[PDB]
Design a binder for these strands. Structure first.
Lengths: 22, 56, 142, 150, 117, 110, 103
RNA sequence: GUAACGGGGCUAAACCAUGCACCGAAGCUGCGGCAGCGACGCUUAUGCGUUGUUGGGUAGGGGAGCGUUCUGUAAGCCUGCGAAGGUGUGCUGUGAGGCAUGCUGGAGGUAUCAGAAGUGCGAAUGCUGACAUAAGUAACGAUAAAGCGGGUGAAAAGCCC
RNA sequence: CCCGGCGAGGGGAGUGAAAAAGAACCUGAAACCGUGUACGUACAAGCAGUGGGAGCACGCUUAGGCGUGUGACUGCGUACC
């Protein structure tokens, strides 16, 4: 899997996209 | 928009309390051939209200 | 052996007429809530409603002391935006004087289902006549 | 454990607990935390302690009527039927024969019997003099045991 | 020597689930919840073996005060009258006489009234 | 006399078939067949075959007198579900449980 | 006619022929015990106490059974502080049978 | 939202002074039971009718035990007239536990006293498998669009014409 | 052999010691999900228990106020790590 999604976390949800691949 | 505690099987059966099917029980009898049919519908042989209709 | 428990299906109840004319409100209401609970009977069980039926009449002629007739305020909240509503003692007397005795007694009774079934044995009246003459209420001097 | 030493999922950011190896002992197929090695379970017995134990057990074989001493106990031909009849004569069911000089015909005539054992006076051990019901010593075997232990 | 756990673990779980019968939901079906429920019932049993004596004492005193006021004396004056007469009957038996034998209780009230003055 | 018919491993969820099996419990079997004939569910088609097979197993094996029979005991149990993969968005794999049933109809004239 | 006596620090109200579960006495299972400390004998006309013992009354009872009651469970639990005790307890009792009230 | 006695209510059911009553704890006492330490009556493989006192407890120290698998005892003892395991019931120990049987099971278990441990799980966003919950809910993947007659068939909106 | 679509699945018959061994096959635990029965529940507020406790159901002994199941009502009681 690999789509990212937060402004800046390691893995949260968020509709943005530079922080986030679980 | 997600749950914080799993609902019980009591609450699950209470939600399904209104999911029950109303049985029909109102089948009409054709007067010509004596066949059971739905009320206001044709028969499996195809009569309706006594007189002959479609086919089959 | 075990301590006696009054069975709730063979409790013998009586009927009483109390005239609330000129008596103090809470000083009458605590003897009301005493006899409604059954504290005057030697067979008293706390989880059973062993008390009596009580008929209160002339409840618009009840007396309070001090300056409480123009200054004792009853508050109820309706459950809304503004909600808080506010009536004094003599407004309650002019409006529905049964609720004065009933609020006093319901406050002096326990909470829960059994306390409500104790409150159900209270028949308050703003007049001198009642309707339970079939029940033969022997007169109570409170 | 046969397997690779790479990290299964990266340190931060999945929903999983952190792991470092498929060979972790708290994971399936790849366990034992304190796995056994082949080891030697032998204990040291002092010479005087071993001989004091043999003297105590052989004294109890005397005092509990579990010791028989005969002049000679042998057999003419190596067949177990002769020793079977011979030990049924002497009322001996579960028996430890002990002989001074090590015999061959007596070693073959009792090799098949499990109730019977045959030892030299040199080859005594503490756990067999307690195990068998009766102990039949030769008089030469009593002389050799009394030499070896004193 | 490798020791499998399943039989003794199953016995130790079945004891706790057997002590959890009657309970609601996972409290009677699930070992994690039922263990906490069984320990909580144990704490309640410990606390309420003490609470029982207090509650029955309350009930006995309420019935003694009821029947004494049925006879015309309060509780405190009546217990004063039974101390000033050297009467050692406890409050359980006085509540039992107040329920079942009102004439014997009237006799005890007359005794305590005569001793009270 | 009880007479049992089963549809084991029926490809329908147990919750769907119980909603039709609760229509015809305690009914006479002649009335239950018409209830299942004019019911617009797929489970009615599944449970009508089991009811008809119970009628026939009664008639052929021991039985009596089809006018007498009642549907005394009807129940649906959960069967072995099939495990399937459903791809979703962003490389996530869901599983599909393809749930099966066991349908049991006991017919008995007394 | 009933009677109030006192055996194990507790008091008992009893009639002619009841079985009373007392605390354990050092009396064998056939001896008839006599409680001479009786607090009230009652009837239609009743002998109460003045001084705390009825001087001219005595109760006699046949000792029926020695035994132990229900096993009770003591649970001491201290949450978040790493402590619990489980303990069992059965209490000894003596079932006596009141054979005689002597007014 | 009454909201500065907990509440009802109170002109005492408020405050001060004098008392006597009474309620009130797991405190003290009464009855029964267990255990730890120090010591007297009878007396030793010392048991106690005894009797002084003690017995909340985290980190931690000390003492005593239960259960599980495997080894000796044991080519012994139980067991197809029913073992292990599973599921109830009863009895019993202060506890871990133990004993006996109903049913299921269908071939192995193991007294006592010693020995050795992969020896006891509820947590580690533990690991594997199974099954829930949300829920019969979202969705069924381009808004290019279908309608009828006949055929086949157990059954046709979708197949063939 | 019968139901069903020359189905799947089942009911008999038969093999067997056993189909409470039918191949989705020894034993068959728990979570989970049902059917039937007994009791409770639609004016009542909260870690769901505990202490008391009526009524009901079912075994009792040949009354004895006790067992088993449910638990109206009531005092106390804000999980575990």
């Amino acid at each position: 899997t690999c789509a990212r999604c937060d402004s800046x976390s390691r893995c949260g949800a968020x509709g943005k996209x530079s922080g986030x691949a679980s | 928009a997600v749950q914080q505690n799993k609902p019980t099987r009591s609450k699950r059966g209470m939600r399904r309390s209104h999911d029950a099917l109303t049985a029909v029980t109102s089948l009409s009898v054709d007067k010509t051939s004596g066949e059971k049919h739905l009320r206001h519908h044709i028969t499996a042989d195809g009569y309706y209200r006594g007189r002959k209709v479609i086919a089959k | 052996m075990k301590t006696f428990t009054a069975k709730p299906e063979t409790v013998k109840r009586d009927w009483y007429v109390v005239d609330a004319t000129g008596k103090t409100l809470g000083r009458l209401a605590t003897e009301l809530a005493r006899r409604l609970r059954g504290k005057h009977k030697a067979e008293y069980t706390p989880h059973v409603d062993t008390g009596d039926y009580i008929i209160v009449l002339n409840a618009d002629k009840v007396a309070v002391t001090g300056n409480k007739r123009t200054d004792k305020v009853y508050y109820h909240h309706t459950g809304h935006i503004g909600g808080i509503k506010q009536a004094t003692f003599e407004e309650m007397i002019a409006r529905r004087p049964e609720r004065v005795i009933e609020i006093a007694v319901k406050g002096m009774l326990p909470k829960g289902p059994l306390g409500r079934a104790m409150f159900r044995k209270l028949k308050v009246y703003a007049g001198n006549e009642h309707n339970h003459a079939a029940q033969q209420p022997q007169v109570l001097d409170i | 454990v046969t397997g690779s030493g790479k990290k299964p999922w990266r340190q931060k950011g999945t929903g999983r607990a952190r792991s470092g190896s498929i060979k972790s002992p708290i994971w399936r197929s790849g366990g034992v935390t304190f796995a056994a090695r082949p080891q030697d379970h032998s204990q040291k017995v002092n010479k005087k302690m071993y001989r004091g134990a043999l003297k105590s057990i052989l004294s109890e074989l005397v005092r509990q009527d579990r010791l028989i001493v005969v002049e000679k106990f042998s057999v003419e031909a190596p067949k177990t039927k002769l020793l079977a009849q011979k030990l049924k004569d002497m009322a001996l069911e579960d028996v430890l024969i002990i002989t001074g000089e090590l015999d061959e015909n007596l070693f073959l005539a009792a090799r098949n019997l499990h109730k019977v054992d045959v030892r030299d006076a040199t080859g005594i051990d503490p756990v067999s003099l307690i195990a068998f019901d009766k102990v039949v010593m030769t008089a030469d075997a009593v002389k050799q045991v009394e030499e070896m232990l004193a | 020597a490798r020791v499998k756990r399943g039989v003794i673990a199953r016995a130790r779980h079945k004891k706790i689930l057997k002590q959890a019968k009657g309970y609601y939901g996972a409290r009677s079906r699930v070992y994690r919840v039922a263990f906490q429920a069984v320990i909580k019932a144990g704490q309640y049993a410990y606390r309420d073996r003490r609470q029982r004596k207090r509650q029955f004492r309350q009930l006995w005193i309420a019935r003694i005060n009821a029947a004494a006021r049925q006879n015309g004396i309060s509780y405190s004056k009546f217990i004063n009258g039974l101390k000033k007469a050297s009467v050692e009957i406890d409050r359980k038996i006085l509540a039992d006489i107040a329920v079942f034998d009102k004439v014997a209780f009237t006799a005890l009230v007359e005794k305590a009234k005569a001793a009270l003055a | 006399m009880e007479t049992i018919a089963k549809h084991r491993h029926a490809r329908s969820s147990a919750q769907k078939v119980r909603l039709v099996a609760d229509l015809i419990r305690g009914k006479k079997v002649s009335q239950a067949l018409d209830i299942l004939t004019y019911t617009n569910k797929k489970a009615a088609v599944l449970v009508k075959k089991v009811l008809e097979s119970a009628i026939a197993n009664a008639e052929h094996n021991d039985g009596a007198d089809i006018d007498d029979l009642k549907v005394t005991k009807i129940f649906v149990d959960e069967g072995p579900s099939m495990k399937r993969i459903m791809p979703r968005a962003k490389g996530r794999a869901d599983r599909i449980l393809k749930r099966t049933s066991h349908i049991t109809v006991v017919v008995s004239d007394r | 006619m009933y009677a109030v006596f006192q055996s194990g620090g507790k008091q008992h109200r009893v009639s002619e022929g009841q079985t009373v579960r007392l605390e354990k006495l050092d009396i064998a299972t056939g001896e008839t015990v006599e409680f001479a400390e009786v607090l009230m004998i009652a009837n239609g006309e009743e002998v109460k106490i003045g001084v705390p013992f009825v001087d001219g009354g005595v109760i006699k009872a046949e000792v029926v059974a020695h035994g132990r009651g229900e096993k009770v469970k003591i649970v001491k639990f201290r949450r978040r502080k790493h402590y619990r005790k489980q303990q069992g307890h059965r209490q000894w009792f003596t079932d006596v049978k009141i054979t005689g009230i002597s007014a």
